[PDB]
């Protein structure tokens, strides 16, 4: 069936069909374009007219231009031939390596797995990152979220996780660049070639790449996450092996929806967002999951506009996660990296019956001492340290050492820290904080604990700091 | 002097255009006479406010804080005419009203970049009795430059501002515990800053009914010298009130002598 | 002991006046946030 463009306003294109009107979600092909331009049907406006969202720029479009109904939603290449390749929203190769040598395809719109398909298995996934492992550990096959305002360390952390978890992974990984920097896409692509996780000459590639960065119009940015996760769903269901799915940044899916919302004729909801924010997110998030058929460990970077965690976008995201790592500018500003808020990061498996009583007790002990110090800071800033009881100033000095021992040099952050990266075993993480809490290092200077790996390095640093 | 008036008894169309009427009169004297012109406007905010009133009647979709979407361009098209050219000089002084004391309000906020010198007044300062109620840490000039005013002027100015800023970022602790809790070092900076704050006040010829004092006009060299001496600690022994509502530094000395 | 009694009496008074001043700032901001959000919603709907 054939339609004609009747209106163009930014990324939103209205198309009239004299006969066979395409259903919502269908992919339409604009004729007379040099490069393929897909419109996705969003609404039926009435009068044989559909309202659509463009997957590429709308410059050059003319009222009267012919549009073909493909008879299906956007369909993309899936399967092992996506590994080591880079794809865009509509499935095209963007790596100058010729066609995606596949002939299995999948619609980017799909129903979420049902309640009966859910798995309740939850076992710890050790990261080698002290703050994460101690306080809010990740679970294999679980949903992990990395919250943060602009420039606090979401991407550095996700890259460190890819380094610490994915490089020694027994299955396949999918990375979805959603509304982020193209430079970061180039960085990651060449890094994985250098590491061999992508191989341009044999079939040993472990990672499939999907990108629609902040250079793209909102339709692209609204849909690239669906493309990225469709690739993941194939590896989960048709194989049954374990999959890692990394998304940076999932906020950009919601932001793109908000960019076109007024042009789709919607009254705004709170904070300028689309009224559909939560159901939109729900239909997308509920597909990102482990099932009885296969495991997905998902790690999603989540932007926090204006650093406000109550912003509808991040606020609605929390309920979709099993583990939350919340980054804070207030902490990053102090040179504490990773900038994890130890009093705002949580995990379903932070339970004495899962991690054991030792792990749980030390984690809660660390949180208590830090909350006690936080509550004191403001009082002592005005009335002075000398007004504190011996018990209070002991909790102050230990808390400040604990804050520092949570900081850690990342291998992927060597260009920022000037320190060699470190990976700390969970056993050593527990022991280290246990000893600080127990007052075993009360005699050591504060700075000995800053920017090190295991507790033995803090002792060595204290000796070095003497002379 | 030529006078042009469209006051707060007028409907908004008149209040929105009357500034242009004033400008036009000045433009003639600048261009067709190539002469030094002074232009005084009280109050240019009223131009933008009047624009907001008409915009509401024109049915425009409103911008932030209920303002006209054209606030900045309307202001630009008007302000860019208030200017010196190669053809003639206009020294312009515009009083700028600040809604609810909010300097971030789109009206005053957009006005800043149209100015070469800004004198920002503060209600808090006025309430302390310092007149003129100038905020010494929020008032700026393009000619505050050592290559323009000379290093001596520049150094004393920046020195005054440093001590005032150092006093400012102690306000939190002072408001709770008072000055007596501070270190000797900080007490010294507080005492001098408070004297400088007072020496920045001045009786105006125009405000004699309100101050009760004869108006004073101070030569630039005397202003530089007075604040130079305070910063150097030459008057650390003198009471703060001696520096209040005087002209040159000699009056602060004479005032202290009458007290003790 | 007299001087501490004195200074702390005055500090507690200054704290009281600051609590009032801050509570008033809090509540003006509280109301302004609600009003501003609503005006943005109304403008988008109109």
């Amino acid at each position: 069936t054939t339609g004609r463009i009747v209106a163009v306003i930014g990324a939103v294109v209205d198309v009239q069909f004299d006969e066979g009107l395409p259903p919502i979600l269908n992919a339409l092909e604009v004729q007379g374009r040099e490069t393929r331009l897909v419109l996705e049907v969003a609404q039926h406006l009435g009068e044989s007219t559909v309202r659509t969202i463009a997957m590429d720029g709308t410059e050059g479009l003319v009222r009267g231009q012919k549009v073909l109904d493909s008879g299906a939603p956007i369909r993309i290449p899936v399967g092992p031939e996506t590994l080591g390749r880079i794809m865009n929203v509509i499935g095209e190769p963007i790596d100058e390596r010729g066609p995606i040598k596949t002939k299995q395809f999948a619609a980017i719109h799909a129903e979420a797995p049902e309640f009966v398909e859910m798995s309740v298995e939850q076992e710890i996934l050790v990261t080698g990152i002290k703050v994460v492992d101690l306080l809010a550990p990740y679970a294999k096959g679980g949903k992990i979220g990395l919250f943060g305002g602009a420039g606090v360390g979401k991407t550095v952390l996700i890259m460190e996780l890819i380094n610490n978890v994915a490089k020694a992974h027994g299955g396949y990984s999918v990375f979805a660049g959603v509304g982020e920097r193209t430079r970061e896409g180039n960085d990651l692509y060449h890094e994985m070639i250098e590491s061999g996780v992508i191989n341009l000459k044999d079939a040993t590639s472990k990672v499939a790449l999907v990108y629609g960065q902040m250079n793209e119009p909102p339709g692209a940015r609204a849909r690239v996450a669906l493309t990225g996760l469709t690739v993941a769903e194939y590896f989960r269901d048709q194989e049954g092996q374990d999959v890692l799915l990394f998304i940076d940044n999932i906020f950009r899916f919601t932001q793109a929806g908000s960019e076109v919302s007024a042009l789709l004729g919607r009254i705004p909801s709170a904070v300028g967002y689309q009224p559909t924010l939560a159901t939109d997110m729900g239909t997308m998030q509920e597909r990102i999951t482990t099932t009885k058929k296969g495991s997905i460990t998902s790690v999603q970077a989540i932007y926090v506009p204006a650093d406000d965690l109550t912003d509808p976008a991040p606020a609605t995201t929390f309920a979709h996660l099993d583990a939350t790592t919340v980054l804070s500018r207030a902490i990053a500003e102090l040179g504490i990296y990773p900038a994890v808020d130890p009093l705002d990061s949580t995990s379903r498996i932070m339970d004495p019956n899962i991690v054991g009583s030792e792990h749980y007790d030390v984690a809660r002990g660390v949180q208590k001492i830090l909350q006690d110090y936080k509550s004191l800071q403001d009082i002592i800033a005005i009335l002075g340290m000398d007004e504190l009881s011996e018990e209070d100033k002991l909790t102050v000095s230990r808390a400040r050492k604990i804050q520092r021992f949570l900081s850690q040099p990342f291998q992927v952050a060597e260009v920022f820290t000037g320190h060699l990266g470190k990976l700390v075993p969970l056993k050593e993480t527990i022991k280290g904080f246990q000893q600080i809490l127990a007052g075993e290092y009360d005699h050591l200077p504060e700075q000995a604990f800053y920017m090190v790996g295991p507790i033995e390095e803090a002792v060595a640093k204290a000796d070095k700091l003497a002379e | 002097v030529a006078l042009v008036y469209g006051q707060m008894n007028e409907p908004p169309g008149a209040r929105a255009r009357v500034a242009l009427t004033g400008l036009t009169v000045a433009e003639y004297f600048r261009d067709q006479e190539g002469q030094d012109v002074l232009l005084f406007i009280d109050n240019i905010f009223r131009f933008t406010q009047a624009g907001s009133e008409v915009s509401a009647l024109l049915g425009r979709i409103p911008s932030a804080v209920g303002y006209q979407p054209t606030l900045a361009t309307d202001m630009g098209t008007m302000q860019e005419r208030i200017t010196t050219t190669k053809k003639g000089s206009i020294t312009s002084v515009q009083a700028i009203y600040v809604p609810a004391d909010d300097l971030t309000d789109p009206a005053p906020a957009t006005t800043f970049a149209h100015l070469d010198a800004t004198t920002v007044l503060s209600r808090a300062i006025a309430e302390l009795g310092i007149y003129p109620a100038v905020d010494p840490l929020d008032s700026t000039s393009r000619i505050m430059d050592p290559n323009i005013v000379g290093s001596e002027h520049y150094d004393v100015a920046r020195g005054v501002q440093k001590i005032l800023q150092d006093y400012k970022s102690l306000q939190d602790i002072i408001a709770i515990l008072g000055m007596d809790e501070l270190s000797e070092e900080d007490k010294l900076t507080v005492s001098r800053a408070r004297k400088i704050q007072r020496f920045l006040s001045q009786p105006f010829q125009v405000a004699e009914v309100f101050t009760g004092h004869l108006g004073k006009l101070v030569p630039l060299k005397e202003t530089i010298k007075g604040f130079q001496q305070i910063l150097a600690g030459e008057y650390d022994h003198l009471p703060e009130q001696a520096f209040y509502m005087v002209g040159p530094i000699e009056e602060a000395v004479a005032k202290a002598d009458k007290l003790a | 002991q007299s001087a501490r009694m004195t200074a702390m009496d005055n500090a507690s008074k200054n704290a009281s006046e600051m609590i009032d001043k801050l509570t008033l700032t809090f509540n003006r901001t509280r109301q302004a946030v609600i009003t501003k959000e609503l005006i943005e919603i109304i403008s988008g709907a109109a």
Binding site: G384, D386 | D180, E181 | A3, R4, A7
Partner: peptide
């Protein structure tokens, strides 16, 4: 501390921990 101008007004022995920390 927290007694106003007690320590500052009076400020090698000195009786009081404020005396030596200030001098």
């Amino acid at each position: 501390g927290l007694c106003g101008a007690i320590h500052s007004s009076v400020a090698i022995i000195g009786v009081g921990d404020k005396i030596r920390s200030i001098l």
